Paper text:
GH19 chitinase hydrolyzes the glycosidic bonds of chitin, namely beta-1, 4-linked N-acetyl-D-glucosamine. One of the physiological roles of chitinase is to defend plants against pathogenic fungi by degrading chitin, a major component of the cell wall of many fungi. By revealing the evolutionary history and loops appearance of GH19 chitinase, we discover that one loop which is remote from the catalytic site, is necessary to acquire the new antifungal activity.
To investigate the contribution to the antifungal activity of the 45 substitutions, we constructed mutants of Anc4 + Loop II with substitutions in proximity to loop II. We chose six substitutions within 4.0 Å from Loop II and introduced them accordingly to their proximity to each other’s. The His 13 residue is also involved in hydrophobic interaction with Trp78 residue in loop II (upper left in the enlargement). d197(217)R (residue numbers are responsible to Anc5ΔLoop I; residue numbers in Anc5 state are in parentheses) substitution formed new hydrogen bonds between the N terminus and the tenth α-helix (upper right in the enlargement). n193(213)G substitution reduced structural hindrance with the Tyr76 residue in loop II (bottom left in the enlargement). These substitutions increased antifungal activity while retaining the same degree of chitinase activity. MD simulations of these mutants revealed a gradual reduction of loop II flexibility directly related to the introduction of these six substitutions Furthermore, these substitutions decreased only the mobility of loop II not the one of a loop region between the ninth and tenth α-helices (positions 192–201). Furthermore, crystal structures of Anc4 + Loop II + A and Anc4 + Loop II + A + B + C revealed that their loop II structures are retained as in the structure of Anc5’s loop II, namely the antifungal active variant. Altogether, these results exemplify that antifungal activity enhanced by cell wall binding activity is supported by the substitutions that rigidify loop II.
Author numbering: 0 to 231
Write the structure that this text describes.
């Protein structure tokens, strides 16, 4: 998987909520994560997941010890907790008294994501969304759920990084060629790819390249997403 000492090197300044043991327990619920493909493909997948996590939870600053990519996994909850992040749903009804703001390593948000994520994990996250911010095993599981789960027309980020997604002719025409860039496109491409301001996407790439360097792997091809359109 990832050794404890390597986890503690990549995430040297993290919030101690996010324990290595909790990450390992979560990954055992998604056993193909980081175990798919040859050695370089596995390292790239792990670096890619951790890069996105770090970008979404970073407490870094430009003169921080160990540099601006060493401060991933500092944040648990979204700061502004005034909006409920509730879109009325008959399938995933918003629980009275609860809110669906961002929680965990990939900032799970909205009743319409807490619902299906919870169902897949066997946890009532729709009616107890605060679970994600209480229990680091659950927190990591919500992030791996997102990484590992297709949402047609989008493949899973896992499949993109491990050779299990082959683009259609339309994907290719749109610049969606397998690599790290497509994972940014899946996560938040409507805001960060295409003609969006490229700053956030370029930050994700910088974490990814740094983590690939530490793991001793080439980052591979197609890292940018400015030359690709978000999935329809």
């Amino acid at each position: 998987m990832v050794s404890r000492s390597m986890f503690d090197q990549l995430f040297k300044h993290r919030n101690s909520f996010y324990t290595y043991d909790a990450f390992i327990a979560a990954a055992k619920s998604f056993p193909s994560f980081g175990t798919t493909g040859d050695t370089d493909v596995r390292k790239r997948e792990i670096a890619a997941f951790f890069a996105h996590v770090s970008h979404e939870t970073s407490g870094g600053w430009p003169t921080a010890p160990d540099g601006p990519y060493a401060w991933g996994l500092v944040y648990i909850e979204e700061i502004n907790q005034s909006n409920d992040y509730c879109d009325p749903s008959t399938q995933y009804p918003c629980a009275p008294g609860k809110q669906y703001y961002g929680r965990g390593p990939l900032q799970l948000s909205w009743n319409y994501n807490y619902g299906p994520c919870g169902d897949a994990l066997g946890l009532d996250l729709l009616n107890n969304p605060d679970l994600v911010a209480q229990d680091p095993v659950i927190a990591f599981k919500t992030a791996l759920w997102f990484w590992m789960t297709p949402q047609s027309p989008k493949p899973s980020c896992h499949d993109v990084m491990t050779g299990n997604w082959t683009p259609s002719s339309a994907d290719l025409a749109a610049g969606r060629v397998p690599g790290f860039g497509v994972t940014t496109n899946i996560i938040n491409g409507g805001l960060e790819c295409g003609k969006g301001n490229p700053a956030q996407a370029e930050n994700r790439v910088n974490y990814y390249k740094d983590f690939c360097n530490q793991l001793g792997v080439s980052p591979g091809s197609n890292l940018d997403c400015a030359n690709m359109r978000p999935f329809g």
